[PDB]
Amino acid sequence: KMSECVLGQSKRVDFCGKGYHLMSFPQSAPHGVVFLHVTYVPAQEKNFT
Amino acid sequence: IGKIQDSLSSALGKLQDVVNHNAQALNTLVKQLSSKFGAISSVLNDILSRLDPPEAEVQIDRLITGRLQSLQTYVTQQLIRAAEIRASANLAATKMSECVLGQSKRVDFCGKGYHLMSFPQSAPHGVVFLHVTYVPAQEKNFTTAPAICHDGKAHFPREGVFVSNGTHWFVTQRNFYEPQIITTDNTFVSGNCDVVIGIVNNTVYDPLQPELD
Amino acid sequence: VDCTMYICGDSTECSNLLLQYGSFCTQLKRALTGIAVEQDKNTQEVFAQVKQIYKTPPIKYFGGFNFSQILPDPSKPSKRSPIEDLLFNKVKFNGLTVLPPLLTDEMIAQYTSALLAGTITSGWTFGAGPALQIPFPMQMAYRFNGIGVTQNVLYENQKLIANQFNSA
Amino acid sequence: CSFGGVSVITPGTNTSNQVAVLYQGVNCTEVPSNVFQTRAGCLIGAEYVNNSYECDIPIGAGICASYQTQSIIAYTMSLGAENSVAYSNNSIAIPTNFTISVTTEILPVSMTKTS
Ligand SMILES: *[C@@H]1O[C@H](CO)[C@@H](O[C@@H]2O[C@H](CO)[C@@H](O)[C@H](O)[C@H]2NC(C)=O)[C@H](O)[C@H]1NC(C)=O
Ligand SMILES: *[C@@H]1O[C@H](CO)[C@@H](O[C@@H]2O[C@H](CO)[C@@H](O)[C@H](O)[C@H]2NC(C)=O)[C@H](O)[C@H]1NC(C)=O
Ligand SMILES: *[C@@H]1O[C@H](CO)[C@@H](O[C@@H]2O[C@H](CO)[C@@H](O)[C@H](O)[C@H]2NC(C)=O)[C@H](O)[C@H]1NC(C)=O
Ligand SMILES: *[C@@H]1O[C@H](CO)[C@@H](O[C@@H]2O[C@H](CO)[C@@H](O)[C@H](O)[C@H]2NC(C)=O)[C@H](O)[C@H]1NC(C)=O
Ligand SMILES: *[C@@H]1O[C@H](CO)[C@@H](O[C@@H]2O[C@H](CO)[C@@H](O)[C@H](O)[C@H]2NC(C)=O)[C@H](O)[C@H]1NC(C)=O
Ligand SMILES: *[C@@H]1O[C@H](CO)[C@@H](O[C@@H]2O[C@H](CO)[C@@H](O)[C@H](O)[C@H]2NC(C)=O)[C@H](O)[C@H]1NC(C)=O
Ligand SMILES: *[C@@H]1O[C@H](CO)[C@@H](O)[C@H](O)[C@H]1NC(C)=O
Ligand SMILES: *[C@@H]1O[C@H](CO)[C@@H](O)[C@H](O)[C@H]1NC(C)=O
Ligand SMILES: *[C@@H]1O[C@H](CO)[C@@H](O)[C@H](O)[C@H]1NC(C)=O
Ligand SMILES: *[C@@H]1O[C@H](CO)[C@@H](O)[C@H](O)[C@H]1NC(C)=O
């Protein structure tokens, strides 16, 4: 995840959150890591022919 | 490719480790055949020679219990070591699919750089991948803008970046410097030039307009 | 764990009797030492993924977007960020000993802030070679292309997009 | 009391026969020159310098040792160089050349079948 979501942009579905992965930021936790995933979510659709 | 050959001919510690661990465990298994575990000796031909059958049962059981314990410890640690070799082989099988029979876009999965191609080589109990990647070099700075304003319209590059060498404005592709004149063939239009922040004023050249005339 | 001191423990009648079991205690110490050496390699593999220790510029103004809650806090001994401070407030015997990790968590926070400044300043170029600066709005527009949105959708909605990021 | 493991730090017998000794998480006043107190125990036989190098022999809690300054030394490891990106609101860097690089990756697939 640090390689593919923080050092790049991923096209793997759901590997870096819900939506279309834009970017990710790491934070250190005690004995662990936290990833803040920024994604794009579409909204307010209309129907068409 | 000529330097791989030197650096190896002159590094396989992950393969040497596996071998060493297995040998160190097999030796510890045999070296336990010479402990008493609380008996008079370690030899069954010595308990069956200075003890009558009713007294040698008690001494043989003390050896049986110890040797069973040692064999079962050996068999547990092999299950735990095989579950780790299995995951490594599962990763090697994925790298053979995704780096050798394809081009990967995953970052740092098939080397460091931009993956071009991969070649496999067999090793004693494993596999070596030779990863060929592209690495950009020798960068310059320029100044940029997000869009160009011309005739009251805002133009964006189709597949590049707008750059300036100090006095003139070009389009490059983003990973290799190769400047081009900004025309209506490598840009597209959307909107008027007062909502983007950072627009610059410059001329966008129409190829038909002169040539026709 | 010291096998001999957990089992016997001081006494001497127990050490000579335990000597009769062979290398059972040497195996256990090897097993526990391997585990402890693996825990440092876990952390080296997650966090030491960067060549240089990158710094953000002083002005600290990326076309708007506001990263202040996740950049390091200069008024601290640990130099953690505001969210890393929130996360750290929520989480001798009979031969037993606890070894310290090789990396302090000051060092870990220093690796994470450098990964952050690499991303905010160079996008994805520092992960493939030398860091190449690019303005943040233009990097955001490159990323909108990667999900299949046309890049004027970003430039014509920059303020709204930055406000939504900041609220989230 | 004050029990603990004892570790021996050596540059390798093919380099020297000097040695340093770590008494693990023991206060360095109750051990029985260079006596140096660490978060990992008491170190004897190495001098503490103020420089900082790349880690050589890992002691712990950020301290490493080396045979440099002849003898072994202690210090705090180095995370890495220091690169300063000249970021601005209208500056870009673009590469003008490239290098083709090739690296290796080694992976175990099997182990020996024993019965
Ligand atoms: C697009 O049109 C469809 C109908 O063709 C809408 O679907 C209906 O939604 C309503 C409200 O939720 C339901 O009561 C109906 O039963 C749905 N129709 C069917 C056939 O099930 C849909 O909501 C419209 N979407 C948009 C964005 O306009
Ligand atoms: C891009 O331009 C910047 C701006 O001058 C250069 O970065 C400076 O370089 C000088 C000399 O190396 C340093 O003393 C400054 O500290 C740098 N940063 C500043 C001024 O903010 C950089 O060298 C240029 N890059 C290339 C590839 O030419
Ligand atoms: C930016 O690049 C342009 C190239 O188009 C340079 O302008 C030309 O320079 C050549 C050689 O100096 C002249 O023969 C041309 O007459 C110039 N103009 C044109 C329209 O081609 C310009 O000098 C460069 N600027 C900097 C600062 O390097
Ligand atoms: C880019 O070009 C436009 C049009 O040529 C400039 O707009 C003019 O700016 C001057 C000076 O501010 C005004 O007096 C005119 O009324 C403007 N005309 C229009 C149609 O807007 C604009 O200023 C230029 N931008 C820069 C930075 O020079
Ligand atoms: C980035 O966001 C933070 C909020 O998390 C801003 O800091 C707060 O700003 C409001 C007013 O805008 C104050 O009332 C708070 O006291 C601030 N909190 C602090 C300083 O911890 C910060 O100003 C934003 N950055 C910029 C450049 O606007
Ligand atoms: C791009 O880089 C290559 C080096 O990788 C340059 O080619 C070298 O040029 C020097 C000087 O002319 C020679 O001594 C080397 O033998 C060349 N290397 C090889 C592998 O042939 C090349 O000139 C660079 N291109 C640009 C435009 O700067
Ligand atoms: C960039 O910052 C400068 C301050 O030096 C400011 O004058 C200018 O308006 C800014 N431009 C953009 C596009 O943010
Ligand atoms: C080990 O000894 C050999 C010969 O004595 C020498 O060539 C080699 O450099 C030595 N290795 C080290 C690490 O000093
Ligand atoms: C060791 O004991 C002395 C005497 O009380 C004390 O000053 C010192 O702090 C102790 N060591 C450590 C690491 O605290
Ligand atoms: C290391 O630097 C500190 C600075 O506070 C100084 O007090 C100390 O004496 C130095 N150590 C040596 C061995 O010179």
Residue numbers in the entry:
A (entry chain B): 1028 to 1076
B (entry chain A): 931 to 940, 944 to 1146
C (entry chain B): 736 to 826, 854 to 930
D (entry chain A): 590 to 621, 640 to 676, 690 to 735
Task: Tell me, in the authors' exact words, what the paper reports.
The Omicron sub-lineages harbor multiple mutations in the S protein compared to the original strain (referred to as the WT strain), which mediates receptor recognition and facilitates membrane fusion with the host cells. Despite the extensive mutations, all these Omicron subvariants still utilize ACE2 as the host receptor. Binding of the receptor-binding domain (RBD) to the peptidase domain (PD) of ACE2 triggers conformational changes in the trimeric S protein, leading to exposure of the fusion peptide and facilitating membrane fusion with host cells. Hence, we characterized the ACE2-bound S protein structures derived from BF.7, BA.2.75, and XBB.1 subvariants.
The BA.5 sub-lineage further evolved into BF.7 and even BQ.1.15. On another branch, BA.2 also evolved into BA.2.75 and BA.2.10.1, and subsequently, these two subvariants recombined to form the XBB variant, which has now become one of the most prevalent substrains globally. We then employed single-particle cryo-electron microscopy (cryo-EM) to determine the structures of trimeric S proteins in complex with ACE2-PD. The structures of ACE2-PD in complex with S proteins from BA.2.75, BF.7, and XBB.1 were resolved at overall resolutions of 3.5, 3.9, and 3.9 Å, respectively. For simplicity, these complexes will be referred to as BA.2.75-SA, BF.7-SA, and XBB.1-SA, respectively. In these structures, the RBDs of the S protein are all in the “up” conformation and each one binds to one ACE2 molecule. Besides, XBB.1 displays mutations D339H, V445P, G446S, F486S, F490V, and R493Q when compared to BA.2. The monomeric human ACE2-PD exhibited binding to the RBDs of BA.2, BA.5, BA.2.75, BF.7, and XBB.1 with binding affinity (KD) of 4.80 ± 0.01, 3.2 ± 0.03, 1.2 ± 0.01, 4.1 ± 0.02, and 16.2 ± 0.03 nM, respectively. These values displayed heterogeneity compared to the WT RBD (12.5 ± 0.04 nM). While the increased affinity of Omicron BA.2.75 and BF.7 subvariants for ACE2 may partially explain their enhanced transmissibility, it does not fully account for the prevalence of the XBB.1 subvariant. The hydrophilic side chain of Ser in XBB.1 may disrupt the original hydrophobic interactions involving Phe486 of the RBD with Leu79 and Met82 of ACE2, thereby providing an explanation for the compromised binding affinity observed in XBB.1 and its RBD.
